[PDB]
């Protein structure tokens, strides 16, 4: 029994065990929370808020571990209302949490928040790749438009903003981002 327990523990990454990133077949999962929303599979907004609040914490921990200070935004990991307060100008509130009853004309704040988080992840990828070009992340990102290129396949591009976008493409984009985070986590843990 002791040998089995030791062999299990010797491979238990701390970040991977705490914020476990995995697939559900169509939903990118963090700690068994479903970061997505599909018609055939509904997702209450509370679960999405929890998923964002956990992804924010994971990326905040990795950024502090690497010592990176993001150029243009600050990550505030608040439990179930996490938000990115724009570093360059502390006036605009960007919440990674939505209260339902969508009014898309006024709820551009959530879209801006997701775009800013994609920007932060792009900076993280830039640092990772510049540090070592031998390691390459599986997906490509573009921040001028808020898109994720499907470099792992046909090359179709997907939008991370729910507005102007379908639910399926949104979920697939978030799945690609979570895969990016998992591989970046692997590299970050390996480098140290």
């Amino acid at each position: 029994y002791a040998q089995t327990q030791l062999d299990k523990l010797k491979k238990t990454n701390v970040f991977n065990a705490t914020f476990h990133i995995w697939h559900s077949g169509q939903f990118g999962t963090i700690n068994n929370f479903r970061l997505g929303r599909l018609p055939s599979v509904p997702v209450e907004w509370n679960e999405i808020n929890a998923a964002w609040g956990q992804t924010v914490l994971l990326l905040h921990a990795l950024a502090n571990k690497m010592g990176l200070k993001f150029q243009r935004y600050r990550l505030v990991p608040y439990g179930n209302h996490s938000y990115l307060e724009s570093l360059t100008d502390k006036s605009k509130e960007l919440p990674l949490y939505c209260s339902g009853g969508l009014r898309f004309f006024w709820d551009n704040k959530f879209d801006h928040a997701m775009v800013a988080f994609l920007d932060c992840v792009q900076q993280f990828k830039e640092e990772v790749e510049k540090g070592e070009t031998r390691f390459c992340l599986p997906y490509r990102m573009d921040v001028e438009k808020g898109k994720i290129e499907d470099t792992g396949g046909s090359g179709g591009s997907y939008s991370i903003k729910t507005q102007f976008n379908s639910e399926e493409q949104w979920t697939k984009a978030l799945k690609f981002m979570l895969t990016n985070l998992k591989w970046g986590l692997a590299w970050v843990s390996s480098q140290f």
Binding site: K10, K11, T12, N13, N16, W22, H23, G25, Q26, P138, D150, G152, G153, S154, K175, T179, K182, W183, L185, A186, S189, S190
Partner: peptide
């Protein structure tokens, strides 16, 4: 592309496990 993504996940987890095992062995 679902199978390809699942293969990506499996390979990433295997690499993480191998890297951590190497780190622990070097610690030893």
């Amino acid at each position: 592309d679902l199978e390809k993504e699942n293969a990506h996940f499996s390979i990433s987890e295997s690499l993480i496990a191998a890297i951590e095992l190497m780190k622990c062995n070097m610690m030893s």
